Design an enzyme around this catalytic site. Structure first.
Site, short mmCIF file in Angstrom:
data_model
loop_
_atom_site.label_atom_id
_atom_site.label_comp_id
_atom_site.label_asym_id
_atom_site.label_seq_id
_atom_site.Cartn_x
_atom_site.Cartn_y
_atom_site.Cartn_z
N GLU A 36 -14.17 4.05 -11.89
CA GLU A 36 -13.01 3.80 -12.49
C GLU A 36 -12.80 2.24 -12.44
O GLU A 36 -12.49 1.68 -13.32
CB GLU A 36 -11.88 4.42 -11.39
CG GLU A 36 -11.28 5.91 -11.92
CD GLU A 36 -10.29 5.43 -13.03
OE1 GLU A 36 -10.53 5.14 -14.15
OE2 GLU A 36 -9.20 5.85 -12.52
N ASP A 54 -3.95 2.54 -15.39
CA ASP A 54 -4.52 2.70 -14.12
C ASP A 54 -4.51 1.32 -13.60
O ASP A 54 -4.62 0.38 -13.88
CB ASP A 54 -5.99 2.98 -14.16
CG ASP A 54 -5.93 4.34 -14.92
OD1 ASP A 54 -5.41 5.24 -14.39
OD2 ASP A 54 -6.57 4.79 -15.67
N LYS A 83 1.83 -3.66 -7.40
CA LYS A 83 1.15 -4.02 -6.23
C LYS A 83 0.14 -3.12 -5.93
O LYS A 83 0.08 -2.70 -4.87
CB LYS A 83 1.99 -4.02 -4.91
CG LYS A 83 3.19 -5.45 -4.73
CD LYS A 83 3.70 -5.47 -3.43
CE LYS A 83 4.13 -6.95 -3.28
NZ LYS A 83 4.42 -6.79 -1.78
N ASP A 86 -4.14 -5.70 -5.45
CA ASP A 86 -4.27 -6.91 -4.22
C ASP A 86 -5.44 -6.74 -3.59
O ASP A 86 -6.34 -5.93 -3.76
CB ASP A 86 -3.25 -6.46 -3.43
CG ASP A 86 -1.68 -6.56 -4.06
OD1 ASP A 86 -1.12 -7.43 -4.36
OD2 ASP A 86 -1.23 -5.40 -4.26
N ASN A 88 -6.10 -5.53 -0.66
CA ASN A 88 -5.95 -4.68 0.70
C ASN A 88 -5.66 -3.17 0.20
O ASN A 88 -5.35 -2.58 -0.85
CB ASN A 88 -4.30 -4.88 1.09
CG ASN A 88 -3.18 -4.06 0.38
OD1 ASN A 88 -3.06 -4.58 -0.80
ND2 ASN A 88 -2.61 -3.22 0.93
N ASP A 91 -2.09 0.69 0.36
CA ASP A 91 -1.26 1.29 -0.62
C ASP A 91 -2.20 2.21 -1.55
O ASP A 91 -1.55 3.08 -2.01
CB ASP A 91 -0.34 0.16 -1.42
CG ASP A 91 -1.34 -0.55 -2.03
OD1 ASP A 91 -1.62 -1.46 -1.38
OD2 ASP A 91 -1.26 -0.61 -3.60
N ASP A 92 -3.14 1.69 -1.98
CA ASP A 92 -3.99 2.23 -3.07
C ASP A 92 -4.53 3.44 -2.33
O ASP A 92 -4.40 4.76 -3.01
CB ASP A 92 -5.18 1.60 -3.18
CG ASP A 92 -4.93 0.62 -4.51
OD1 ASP A 92 -4.32 -0.60 -4.29
OD2 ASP A 92 -5.55 0.84 -5.33
#
Length: 130
Positions: A36, A54, A83, A86, A88, A91-92
């Site tokens: 992806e 996406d 957000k 990023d 990090n 959150d994904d």
């Protein structure tokens, strides 16, 4: 979300509890982000099946779990699609579980159903990590 790798994303998700999550082994989560966004933190789509987009390493569809410029969305995860690119991977992965528990499931992630759930490869996490 950041510039991760095959084993790096597999070991990180395994620690949170994504290893074999819902029958989806660690490879299913790695190959999905490897196709992806290709481990790219800025890799994102603009137009999808419903004109969605996406974002992040997983490239989550902004239409069934996030609000974006796709003419309103379901916002099931309650988080704007800004957000997600990023450096990090928290959150994904937090909203990634929402895309799997919803009615769509891995179907939203084309790289997953076309490179893991549908493509039965025996060289993903098997030849990676320890």
């Amino acid at each position: 979300s950041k510039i991760f790798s095959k084993c790096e994303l597999a070991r990180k998700l395994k620690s949170m509890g994504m290893d074999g999550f819902h029958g989806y082994s660690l490879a299913n989560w790695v190959c999905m982000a490897e196709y992806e966004s290709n481990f790219n933190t800025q890799a994102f789509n603009g137009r999808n099946s419903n004109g969605s987009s996406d974002y992040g390493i997983f490239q989550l569809n902004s239409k069934w779990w996030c609000k974006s410029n796709s003419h309103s969305s379901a916002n099931a995860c309650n988080i704007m699609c800004s957000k997600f690119l990023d450096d990090n991977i928290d959150d994904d992965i937090a909203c990634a579980k929402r895309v799997v528990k919803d009615p769509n499931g891995m179907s939203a992630w084309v790289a997953w159903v076309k490179h893991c759930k549908g493509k039965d490869l025996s060289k993903y996490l098997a030849s990676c990590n320890l």
